[PDB]
Amino acid sequence: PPSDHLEVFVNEQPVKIPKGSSVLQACDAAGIDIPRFCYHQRLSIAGNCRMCLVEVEKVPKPVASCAMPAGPGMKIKTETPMVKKAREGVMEFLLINHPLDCPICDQGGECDLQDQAMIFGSDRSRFVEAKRAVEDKNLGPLVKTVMTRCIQCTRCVRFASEVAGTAELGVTGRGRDSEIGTYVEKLMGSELSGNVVDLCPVGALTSKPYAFTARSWELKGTESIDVSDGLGANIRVDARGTEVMRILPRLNEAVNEEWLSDKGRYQYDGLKHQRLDKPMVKGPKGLQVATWQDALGAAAAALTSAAPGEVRGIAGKLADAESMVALMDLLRGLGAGDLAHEGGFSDMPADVRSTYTANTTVQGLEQSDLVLLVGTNPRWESPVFNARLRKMFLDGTQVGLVGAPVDLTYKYEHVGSDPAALAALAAGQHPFLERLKKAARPAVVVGPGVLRRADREAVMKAVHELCGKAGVVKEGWNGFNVIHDTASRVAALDMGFGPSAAARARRAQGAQPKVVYLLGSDDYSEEDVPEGAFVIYQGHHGDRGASRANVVLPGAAYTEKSGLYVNFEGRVQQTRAAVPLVGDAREDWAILRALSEVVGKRLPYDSHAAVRARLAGIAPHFANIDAVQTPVWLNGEYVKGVEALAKAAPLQPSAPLTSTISNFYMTDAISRASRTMAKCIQARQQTK
Template structure:
């Protein structure tokens, strides 16, 4: 079992244990492209195993070895965490040094001669490994880390074939961290990766070390839960089996899993993920490295909500009968819909796109409604926002760009629950570069200092009138930023508030040469694609009362948008609110069961890939709309996925350039003519996310997310 998967192979599948230094990619900031590669710096030359290597001044010995292509074993070192230097596995020999040095913590000096394969280095590593295994239990056959364990791999490559310790192995009591992270602390080797992650990235200082020597333990000092929306990342960071996934425990081995690259849809950030499947079931979800979006972190909801994919699923078409909903054939379901549509006028037919609607299904639904003569379609929660100017509803600075801001104003948003990975970047900007963060809205409990300015519209007006002290802070900042929550625009006075924010942005220099700091943080994966595709009501449709309503993955619609006497058709994957309201239900595929396009909050199109087959009779949403169009006498002109995507590119050309952000132009002039004036309410600004663990149909069906809610982790 030892060494079944090499470190090199695991590098490709587990970003958190990456052995290879990856240079940062190009990123988009505002309307210009900038390279995140640092400017030319002084370099030094060192020798690694007889080969000269040129590295930036200030690099460590470990970096020099990595640059030379020499793999150095390590347990405590991680490229995104501070240096601890406590595992001593990365020992190398440096000429003229009296003893082996820890390469992760030793600065490289000019003309340094580094040796990594000498007998002294091999003996030192064997000794370190012997100490680590002295108290490590022989749990490999029952450990969930088996097959992707750093200790296994490095014991095979760098360890000895025997040990000299005969004392009884110590035992450590397991810690209860909550329903997500399982602990077997006897396996812990005290690398402190989890402690440093909690403090430096998650911003929750719940973990630490107690005791000394043999009695050292990782824990919470006093018994408490690990309260963080990103706690699951310690599972990837742990180099042994001390911290593993509690929902995944004893369900599968890593070599039994098929990995599929995909995109998370639990929020609008579009974090890159790997969907691990066994047969027809999703077994776990892990992060996939993407420096421009989520780096190698994902939120707990993205990681653990997958059990909701097999619960409360809709697997057959259903129609309302005398005794309630009953299973019917596709033909019967389509006939009932056609009968209802025939009794409604063109603008009385309405479509609502929900949080999990993909771009292919949205464009198909829009084309169908338009062919029926209806312009009555809208994105859930955004009924009136104009979509003519992309910069008015995107995160224009890009996700990476938030780290360049030095004065940040949060308005009606709580990034900790709306986008935890983005919150980690805001924390980095606040702590490492000294950015000042202020909030207008309900008081926030973030992971970094926030200045509370006020609760609502009155504070915004003070800022716009230049009478609030924070106006000066923004005006003097080099890169000021405004982050607007999606819940703010969804208010009845949302457009009036947006008008004030645009005025404030103009006065404080939020938008300038090479920098656009006006950002909207959306709360759902499908909304930006809907806005890009113009899935908004026409002027005539806004006044029409709907008699037939198509709910496209819409489970959080406003009751006012669906009249009580309307005939409702629900297209989706779960028996949630939308299905409860429906007269006809058409089973759609979940995001892990289809290849589809989602556009994240910064306007970056990304595609999921089908990891498993759809359940029962479920089909891709766009194929359902395509089949329905024939029955309604308005056949759509595409029959396969490539044709649908060609139509996507025709409506929104940037959809064709997946993984890229098309810079948006700031066209909002000083008159803000495209935003109608209006009165504002005194109601305080609040986040659109009330419960982080339950925000859509999938997470509400998840037992794991229900446990998180019941234990009050937020």
């Protein structure tokens, strides 16, 4: 190569840097953290803060390292008297108009401005004049705006324009009277609208739900994962004692970079309401507080009183792999084979992991210049994934959609809306095929709502046909991908949590069980939960399933334990306990093991590591935490092996490929109990 890595000198240190890198990036590679205010890793170069000024030989003026490209043979100095003089002057110019709001500002303790002033600034001020007074702005109930604190670092504008794609914010006025916000009273319609406060380096933009609640140092930080969807964003949990105070995203380039859905940002409030703390057993007067011994005995009697074919188990959205496998072992050990999943398509065959995962991976998806969407809405299925899709769109990647035309914050081509359009595209009737047939790295992605169709085999067969015709899967590349919207689905698929053929037939003729057990499920259909049937519920929130239940075991929430959760690409991730158990709650797999012992068939494991090892024996990849395997590919042999399922229940060419997600702000009980999501819903309803 023509020396892709050029050489410069920073304070007489030779550092090898890639071509096109900036002096900021070079100094970062040099081990120096230059003060900066407007530059960000994920945004365009703004270069208005003037805080990145450095000294270069043969240059009389300080240069903008946040923007200055590095030339070969360049010399960079960072500790000269002029450097410190410029830094102190810039800090002084920052602080002259800034209001003395630190005691009331919520960013005190984690304010970049404050620390940078402490380090690179002076201690005294010679400004004694009247400051500039700025009125606050309304953007919705999620973000509290104190505009007088704004330093005009323009990060909000760049973020809204590029990542969100809404481009609803701008700079009004001029000079000192330059103003930030919207000229009109507008509500921030961005779904990833909470990232701006984190991106705001000052207290000008603050989380309204978090305002004046607690301080940064009062918190204990626990790195966690997001369970509100199937992407599994890496997050950190901040708490004061047993109470969650705020949840913040953390860096994971291969999953979510530095971004979090506002649904995954503000749903922590629900953990304070409708909480189940004590076991309940339905008496003649109704459900009453009873001991774990009494509840477990009642559950064992109810389970043993019925035949094995009259017991059904259902897994919710937020059940972990450990509890799922424990309950599956429990029900299998008693001759029961009725399994169901709250995430749908519980009867979908799961023999090859690639058939129900994203084989391109999330970061490998960025290598594709052409992307095909088949009946999915990534904006409401995974807004972080939609943001990454937009980032891919920003550098030439074209996207096609087959399904309902919806706002996706970037231009795209609508091929069609029904399976007939997909068949026409596969036949050669549409120009999009030739664009697919000419793309070097084409990509096809299918959502979970397609898997909820009764004709899912036919849709999969058509998709496989199109992939074969366009060569989407070939040597060294796999553009075929399967996504999801719930965490517990992937672990259930990998562990084989699927109903028996006998139970499928029993549903076919209409057999109705009598013992029904819920593992944190609240969005069941009426057909799987007959009325008049005994219900044993395990959960951590009082909701519809809890109300109809007859015996209730207060379980553990994802913020209180460490459960295994694998995202739709097949990467194993685990949560982490940030606060202790609420009330008399117990460990979910411990609860199931206790029930197994009480009934009369003990589970062979007695520890968390033991059940995880049982999972590993069931599927080896469970051991690899925070990694992913390359799934095997079996070409059209799988499709030709599931041809009978295609023959039965033939294709429906009329039903549109829609998204089953109709309420972004409310998908589970925790979302259904969160006050903040309800406030956002009312705000979106008060605009008309």
